[PDB]
């Protein structure tokens, strides 16, 4: 019940929502059908429209009017946004030359520059160039302010997951809004786009910016607007709030536009119809900026212009149907469209089988436009698994397509030419970022970054401490003139041991053999040097990674590589080596194919054993530093140490062997040398965070040797590729991956071909940030460089995407 017999008199767009059954006057009351009876009359005035004309200048105040052109309107904070232009001979903000804002220029009693977030739904990154002719206000913000060529959304590239990521700094798996449609099996309740359940607080996790502000004594404008409140009224309401007295005035505000998404769905991203929506959003920006200039705030307020996601060409005729794959289509529920999520129709049907659904949907048709995944096998860069609202079965849909259960769902449940929701590295899903104001830089381009980073920056702009989030605070310092965050490197928790030669070969009973018993003051003086760290400045270029948890490990040095060997996991946490442009690739000699050698620096009881592999009929082994890249025949023996061996399924060794034998050399050749750091990852509970030993679900049979879920590599070089990787004076360039350690290559539909036709394609799908690897390993990389920490944090958030240029 709502007792809507109350009144909105002097309460229009009140900032604190009043508790039912009293009637509401806030900017969401429409959407809850709860507004007082007189809300339209008092709070949504429209008479005379939105612009002053000469004949109204100096008019008598008439309180029916949507906005005012009377002499008292500046005092009342309720002039039409063009009042000073029409009535006082002022220029529109967009026609003024831009002038650097070196310091805030704020009216008296402003404690801090306000922040205004201008969010646009469906605003695809390439609109900034392709629509430049019809968006002069936006193009000024962009050229005068700080901008990125694009901003990467989170997956799925849907509206509510991305807006709530912008507000929280959290991935959807953590904030809980994982899709526009959701079933939570603990609540036994569903969340829908249309309806009243979605406003139940239990859906929304984390701490959004407005709650962060409020808890720290900063007032916030209400971020959400009911769809029927026109844009001109949203802008006027913001400008009115900005005229409140100091103690009541908010410091942070959001505006939302449903365009260009709304039109983009109907017409496609570049439909002729899309010009007018872009003109209209620009006009809105112009209203806001003219309004700020009237209040003397246009050199005081920080403005962020930001989108949620882009828009791709999608039509009804590009729909795959699960009815063409499965027989049992009626025993499943599908969340359809630009992604698929599948679960059982009934929990009381114990005949439904995920393994057979996956198999029926895997590489079944030559042109197939979706790929099925168990959620834990999705690329780790999507961070899309650790939530009970995410179904175990996921379909990654190719850009430009849909998936649906049955044809009747598409014509009885073409009306549309655009959609979004695809993998967040697709170019069409990228969106926009512009920052304009005193705290932002002047006429500055920054590299593309992820939207999870913005919460921390918005907190910095407002003097707030961010709640714990998935941004890397300090990675976006280069966007700001002032208010930078000055991060400190994490402390190392575990110090390494540096073992010498401590065991005779006969103390080991590992069931390993090697044909290595044939053998100066030349190169026995000199191999002592290589086992104490003489080559270490060549192979470890950025310091030892720091171990950020409590453990026991040893640093091991070799001619061609250095490792951090875990006595707990029986294998390296990391292995570091440098491959110069000139380095040569060699084979594994026939007499050394099955060679494994005890490491006399590491006890038998903290070593792997070859018997375990012999008895495990599913599991083989590989090496972290590849024997193919040995510097010399004698150095090659080091690569067959038991301390460089790791468990690998035969199917995975196909990928790994190709990476190590063919790709590393190709990269050194292209990048003028590369430094490689490789290692294992254990993430059996798919939380994106390193597993403790008691979380490991699989071991090499009969042993304490844990099986990794993934293998990583971080590949670093000089950004100025005229310098070799091992003598780089300036900024670095990095690419990284996190490959799933799987016992088949079913993910790769062309895997029965030569590795040269499928492996690199796999590796690109599994591209990763260094920060993703940090989370998964408890390691901290690049501890000793000559670069600023903030720059290193930017490098660690970089993703190499392998998309063409926008
Ligand atoms: C991205 O960033 C995020 C944010 O930092 C990272 O996410 C965090 O990761 C932590 C480690 O996994 C995780 O720690 C949990 O916390 C459990 C308690 O959780 C509740 O409280 C949170 C705090 O809220 C308050 O925050 C501020 C202070 O910061 C306060 O001032 C306010 O008053 C706030 O209320 C709250 O955020 C959290 O939210 C989740 O759950 C809600 C449902 O209740 C959802 O609405 C919401 O969306 C969140 O859901 C996500 O996270 C949960 C896990 O919490 C996950 O299940 C969902 O899928 C979803 O992803 C909660 O309301 C705490 O109990 C845990 O402790 C257990 O483990 C430790 C291990 O060391 C034990 O020592 C400890 O004893 C305990 O064990 C006991 O229970 C075990 C399991 O039941 C059992 O086996 C054992 O035997 C014991 O009985 C642990 O600390 C954070 O909660 C989490 N935060 C968020 C927001 O997600 C994330 O890691 C980052 N991602 C990457 C890749 O880096
Ligand atoms: O007004 C809205 O959103 C504004 C906003 C901006 C930012 Cl940056 C963060 C968030 Cl959480 C929200 N919305 C209005 C409703 C229309 N469709 C669904 C709802 C989203
Ligand atoms: Ca884990
Ligand atoms: Cl969805
Ligand atoms: Cl295979
Ligand atoms: Cl551990
Ligand atoms: Cl593009
Ligand atoms: Zn949309």
XYZ file of N, CA, C and O in Angstrom, residues 510-515 570-572 588-598 608-628 637-657 660 700-701 703 705-708 711 741:
288
model
N 64.045 -41.793 -7.464
C 62.911 -41.138 -8.072
C 62.406 -41.984 -9.244
O 61.303 -41.716 -9.755
N 63.145 -43.036 -9.658
C 62.677 -43.859 -10.764
C 62.902 -43.131 -12.097
O 62.319 -43.462 -13.114
N 63.742 -42.094 -12.052
C 64.130 -41.314 -13.206
C 65.466 -41.876 -13.674
O 66.221 -42.388 -12.835
N 65.716 -41.713 -14.981
C 66.991 -42.004 -15.618
C 67.307 -40.919 -16.642
O 66.424 -40.240 -17.217
N 68.605 -40.743 -16.814
C 69.110 -39.905 -17.876
C 70.461 -40.403 -18.381
O 71.338 -40.771 -17.599
N 70.635 -40.302 -19.697
C 71.866 -40.679 -20.378
C 72.838 -39.508 -20.285
O 73.112 -38.843 -21.285
N 56.071 -28.902 -4.850
C 57.032 -29.726 -5.588
C 57.310 -29.285 -7.037
O 57.578 -30.113 -7.903
N 57.261 -27.993 -7.313
C 57.499 -27.503 -8.639
C 57.692 -26.009 -8.550
O 57.392 -25.402 -7.509
N 58.232 -25.352 -9.595
C 58.388 -23.911 -9.537
C 57.048 -23.183 -9.468
O 56.090 -23.618 -10.124
N 65.405 -31.690 -28.913
C 65.757 -32.612 -27.853
C 66.413 -33.826 -28.518
O 65.723 -34.623 -29.142
N 67.723 -34.034 -28.311
C 68.435 -35.200 -28.849
C 67.744 -36.522 -28.504
O 67.118 -36.646 -27.427
N 67.874 -37.527 -29.409
C 67.151 -38.787 -29.264
C 67.521 -39.463 -27.935
O 66.631 -39.983 -27.276
N 68.794 -39.377 -27.520
C 69.297 -40.091 -26.348
C 68.799 -39.406 -25.053
O 69.025 -39.941 -23.956
N 68.151 -38.222 -25.174
C 67.713 -37.448 -24.001
C 66.176 -37.321 -23.932
O 65.662 -36.682 -23.020
N 65.417 -38.042 -24.777
C 63.962 -37.862 -24.893
C 63.282 -38.034 -23.514
O 62.423 -37.233 -23.131
N 63.684 -39.060 -22.737
C 63.058 -39.380 -21.452
C 63.973 -39.054 -20.251
O 63.753 -39.520 -19.164
N 65.016 -38.264 -20.459
C 65.945 -37.850 -19.407
C 65.269 -36.991 -18.323
O 64.649 -36.001 -18.695
N 65.328 -37.399 -17.034
C 65.031 -36.546 -15.884
C 66.149 -36.759 -14.871
O 66.532 -37.882 -14.650
N 66.697 -35.681 -14.332
C 67.873 -35.673 -13.488
C 67.532 -35.146 -12.085
O 66.993 -34.061 -11.949
N 67.951 -35.836 -11.004
C 67.878 -35.271 -9.644
C 68.648 -33.955 -9.534
O 69.683 -33.752 -10.181
N 59.808 -34.156 -7.111
C 58.890 -35.029 -7.819
C 59.567 -36.389 -8.065
O 60.726 -36.554 -7.823
N 58.832 -37.369 -8.562
C 59.442 -38.664 -8.916
C 58.813 -39.138 -10.218
O 57.692 -38.768 -10.539
N 59.591 -39.836 -11.018
C 59.160 -40.266 -12.338
C 58.248 -41.492 -12.272
O 57.541 -41.723 -13.227
N 58.317 -42.283 -11.193
C 57.444 -43.431 -11.031
C 55.967 -43.026 -11.022
O 55.114 -43.708 -11.601
N 55.670 -41.926 -10.340
C 54.313 -41.428 -10.299
C 53.769 -41.216 -11.703
O 52.632 -41.586 -11.952
N 54.570 -40.701 -12.633
C 54.114 -40.438 -13.968
C 53.906 -41.754 -14.716
O 52.916 -41.921 -15.412
N 54.800 -42.714 -14.489
C 54.747 -44.034 -15.122
C 53.460 -44.737 -14.717
O 52.766 -45.251 -15.563
N 53.031 -44.593 -13.461
C 51.867 -45.280 -12.964
C 50.577 -44.512 -13.293
O 49.506 -45.091 -13.245
N 50.650 -43.201 -13.548
C 49.475 -42.393 -13.883
C 49.296 -42.537 -15.391
O 50.022 -41.933 -16.204
N 48.228 -43.197 -15.778
C 48.034 -43.534 -17.176
C 47.478 -42.341 -17.973
O 47.594 -42.338 -19.203
N 46.956 -41.316 -17.285
C 46.399 -40.144 -17.962
C 47.403 -38.978 -18.042
O 47.224 -38.079 -18.863
N 48.413 -38.946 -17.161
C 49.210 -37.738 -16.923
C 50.626 -37.950 -17.420
O 51.241 -38.983 -17.097
N 51.162 -36.963 -18.151
C 52.555 -36.928 -18.562
C 53.244 -35.725 -17.878
O 52.764 -35.274 -16.857
N 54.373 -35.264 -18.411
C 55.125 -34.162 -17.815
C 55.673 -33.292 -18.929
O 55.967 -33.713 -20.043
N 55.892 -32.029 -18.588
C 56.607 -31.099 -19.422
C 57.601 -30.304 -18.580
O 57.808 -30.644 -17.411
N 58.229 -29.322 -19.210
C 59.244 -28.539 -18.546
C 58.888 -27.076 -18.660
O 58.378 -26.630 -19.673
N 59.244 -26.298 -17.633
C 58.945 -24.876 -17.679
C 59.958 -24.084 -18.518
O 59.535 -23.318 -19.384
N 61.276 -24.262 -18.283
C 62.260 -23.733 -19.199
C 62.432 -24.774 -20.295
O 62.700 -25.939 -20.017
N 62.215 -24.417 -21.567
C 62.223 -25.444 -22.596
C 63.625 -25.930 -22.995
O 64.475 -25.116 -23.325
N 63.852 -27.226 -23.055
C 65.109 -27.730 -23.595
C 65.447 -27.263 -24.987
O 66.632 -27.108 -25.246
N 64.432 -26.882 -25.799
C 64.683 -26.454 -27.162
C 65.478 -25.165 -27.190
O 66.041 -24.835 -28.228
N 71.393 -29.952 -20.245
C 71.234 -30.888 -19.135
C 70.444 -30.259 -17.987
O 69.655 -30.956 -17.352
N 70.659 -28.957 -17.718
C 69.924 -28.217 -16.689
C 68.403 -28.271 -16.929
O 67.586 -28.311 -16.012
N 68.008 -28.230 -18.186
C 66.574 -28.190 -18.475
C 65.855 -29.504 -18.114
O 64.625 -29.508 -17.950
N 66.590 -30.609 -17.976
C 65.983 -31.866 -17.608
C 66.055 -32.169 -16.111
O 65.680 -33.251 -15.647
N 66.358 -31.159 -15.304
C 66.260 -31.308 -13.853
C 64.815 -31.557 -13.421
O 63.828 -30.955 -13.907
N 64.703 -32.373 -12.392
C 63.461 -32.776 -11.798
C 62.761 -31.548 -11.227
O 61.553 -31.520 -11.117
N 63.537 -30.497 -10.974
C 62.987 -29.270 -10.404
C 62.447 -28.332 -11.473
O 61.918 -27.279 -11.122
N 62.575 -28.683 -12.734
C 62.037 -27.892 -13.829
C 60.839 -28.627 -14.478
O 60.277 -28.181 -15.466
N 60.446 -29.775 -13.939
C 59.390 -30.617 -14.508
C 58.031 -30.295 -13.883
O 57.911 -29.964 -12.711
N 56.960 -30.375 -14.681
C 55.649 -30.058 -14.222
C 54.671 -31.069 -14.851
O 54.862 -31.512 -15.988
N 53.543 -31.366 -14.202
C 52.636 -32.351 -14.802
C 51.820 -31.747 -15.934
O 51.190 -30.705 -15.768
N 51.738 -32.490 -17.016
C 51.015 -32.045 -18.198
C 50.312 -33.237 -18.881
O 50.944 -34.277 -19.215
N 48.994 -33.098 -19.091
C 48.254 -34.045 -19.906
C 48.845 -34.048 -21.291
O 49.282 -32.993 -21.838
N 48.903 -35.244 -21.954
C 49.387 -35.330 -23.326
C 48.733 -34.338 -24.276
O 49.411 -33.726 -25.057
N 47.421 -34.135 -24.158
C 46.735 -33.200 -25.032
C 47.303 -31.789 -24.829
O 47.461 -31.042 -25.782
N 47.520 -31.390 -23.580
C 48.134 -30.078 -23.292
C 49.568 -29.948 -23.751
O 50.027 -28.887 -24.171
N 50.313 -31.054 -23.774
C 51.675 -30.986 -24.238
C 51.773 -30.628 -25.700
O 52.759 -29.994 -26.105
N 50.734 -30.928 -26.481
C 50.658 -30.420 -27.844
C 50.698 -28.882 -27.910
O 51.368 -28.279 -28.739
N 49.952 -28.201 -27.034
C 49.932 -26.763 -27.017
C 51.271 -26.211 -26.505
O 51.848 -25.312 -27.117
N 51.710 -26.718 -25.348
C 52.914 -26.277 -24.673
C 54.148 -26.438 -25.547
O 54.961 -25.507 -25.625
N 54.308 -27.601 -26.203
C 55.439 -27.876 -27.083
C 55.501 -26.888 -28.240
O 56.563 -26.325 -28.518
N 56.539 -23.451 -26.875
C 57.947 -23.377 -26.483
C 58.910 -23.561 -27.658
O 59.932 -22.864 -27.705
N 48.910 -36.164 -9.175
C 49.479 -37.239 -9.960
C 49.303 -38.535 -9.125
O 49.593 -38.541 -7.931
N 48.746 -39.559 -9.750
C 48.254 -40.750 -9.038
C 49.365 -41.346 -8.173
O 50.460 -41.556 -8.673
N 50.799 -39.871 -5.501
C 51.833 -38.911 -5.115
C 51.189 -37.693 -4.489
O 49.970 -37.595 -4.453
N 52.047 -34.731 -5.712
C 52.332 -33.771 -6.790
C 51.006 -33.203 -7.305
O 50.243 -33.933 -7.956
N 50.676 -31.944 -6.983
C 49.360 -31.406 -7.367
C 49.278 -31.108 -8.857
O 50.267 -30.690 -9.457
N 48.078 -31.196 -9.442
C 47.917 -30.947 -10.831
C 47.435 -29.513 -10.980
O 46.386 -29.120 -10.483
N 48.157 -28.709 -11.792
C 47.662 -27.364 -12.081
C 46.358 -27.364 -12.864
O 46.140 -28.236 -13.684
N 48.351 -23.088 -16.913
C 49.732 -22.662 -17.023
C 49.760 -21.242 -17.607
O 49.057 -20.931 -18.582
N 44.666 -26.083 -18.432
C 45.393 -27.345 -18.466
C 44.381 -28.488 -18.580
O 43.868 -28.981 -17.605
